[PDB]
Amino acid sequence: HHENLYFQGSSIYPPETSWEVNKGMNSSRLHKLYSLFFDKSSAFYLGDDVSVLEDKPLTGAYGFQSKKNDQQIFLFRPDSDYVAGYHVDAKSDAGWVNDKLDRRLSEISEFCSKATQPATFILPFVEMPTDITKGVQHQVLLTISYDPKSKQLTPTVYDSISLSSYFKGKYRTTCDEILTQSIEKAIKSTDFTLGKFTRAAYNHQNRLTEGNSGSYTFRTIKEVISSSAQGTEVKIPGSGYITSNSYLTSQHVQDIESCIKYRNLGVVDIESALTEGKTLPVQLSEFIVALEDYGKLRSQQSEGYSKTAKLTAVELLIGILNDIKGKNEISESQYDKLVKEVDCLMDSSLGKLVQFHLKNLGAESLQKLVLPCVKFDDTI
């Protein structure tokens, strides 16, 4: 069963305070990362390379116009239905692509048949073996380059990752055959043809990238957009970047983890940021939801400061910040309780959560964030 599935955009990507790059990616987290693209402080800022398009409408995709050349760049929102299943056994057919993914290939084909400018289509998706019951959802990146003069559609799959030539004809290891077939049928009736399909594979050293391969996919989305906007080649590890470390740097990783762990973003806010090219500033309500999530998670494990001390300090601070979110105003006793909890709130992982939101809200400390709202008892 690989059919269309429809979920709407009234949803929220919550703070996942326990997440790290090695914990894996899904379509929801990857979409949440798109908020980084117009934050000037981010290593993934795209604002020097592209600006927003109008529209030029491709359903399910955000349109950008290169600032340095004529290229239009279309980045598809991630979707759990973007799945290609391949059969490992070469005596079976090649596999399948989910109907929704197949519909997008037809929609890209219809767009290109009317296009007068060069365009680049960027689509994150997962490939997976379907007749071997261990099912790993391997995150990959499809890019399609359309050249109106050629007239060629050129697909490429970027793949953050030893059987003989004979067994490579008995066993498939990727979805290239079914994917090629699906693109081919989508364009059969057009006046253009397929360029050379290529799989650029780039992390052969293995550090159990089950994994951060979603983080490399997001990093490659940024390279494809910038490289396409600048008319340059897409440089990736082993082919432009000599180390994976200079490709996905510590700055890149911090940006990814901060966004996923600590932010609380509505889908509608991310669509607003990408269709108008704004940054999404951190709101105090995200601090609250981040602490709530932290407490909810801690209550489950595993059944310094004790678990009871940390949940006590988190309950106290959540109440104070809700008491600041409206009307509002906090008492001197609440503030005095909070002073006694500060050391506990700044300790270990709770402290990094607190420090991220302090920094992004404009306060140097828990006290300086709430002191403007304190009524003392009393004045002079």
**Which of 9-14's residues contact partners 24+ apart within 8 Å by CB, and which partners?**
9/267, 9/268, 9/271, 10/267, 10/268, 11/266, 11/267, 12/264, 12/265, 12/266, 12/267, 13/263, 13/264, 13/265, 13/266, 13/267, 13/270, 14/264, 14/289, 14/293
Take residue 297 and report the two structure tokens written for it: 């998670």
Q: Which residues of 244-278 are buried (b: 16+ CB within 10 A; e: fewer)?
A: beebbeeebbebbbbbbbbbbbebebbeebbeebe
Give, in order, the Cα–Cα distances in Å from 11 to each of 81, 257, 266. Answer: 17, 20, 6
Q: Quick one: DSSP state of residue 183?
A: H
Question: Do residues 275 and 54 lie in contact, with contact meaning Cβ atoms separated by under 8 Å?
Answer: no
DSSP state of 238: T
Any residues with CB less than 8 A from the CB of 234 and at least 6 apart, and which? 158, 200, 220, 223, 224, 227, 228, 240
Separation CA 94–CA 182 (nearest Å): 11
CA triple 5-138-200, angle to 5 deg = 115
Task: Evaluate whether 109 touches 94 at the Cβ level (below 8 Å).
Answer: no
Which phi and psi angles does 237 have, rounded to 5°?
A: -55, 145
Amino acid letter, residue 51: S
Tokens of 364: 């140097």
Torsion, Cα 91 92 97 103, to 10 degrees, reads 100
User: The tokens 């559609």 sit on which residue?
Assistant: 153
For 347, residues 6+ apart whose C-beta sits below 8 A from its C-beta are: 304, 305
Q: Nearest-CA neighbor of 37 among 13, 4, 73?
A: 73
Which DSSP state fits 82? -
Q: For residue 149, which of 185, 197, 192 has the smallest C-alpha distance?
A: 192
Q: What is the resolution of this structure in A?
A: 2.5
Q: How much of the chain is in helix, strand and coil states, percent to nearest 5? A: 40, 20, 40
Tokens of 188: 């059969």
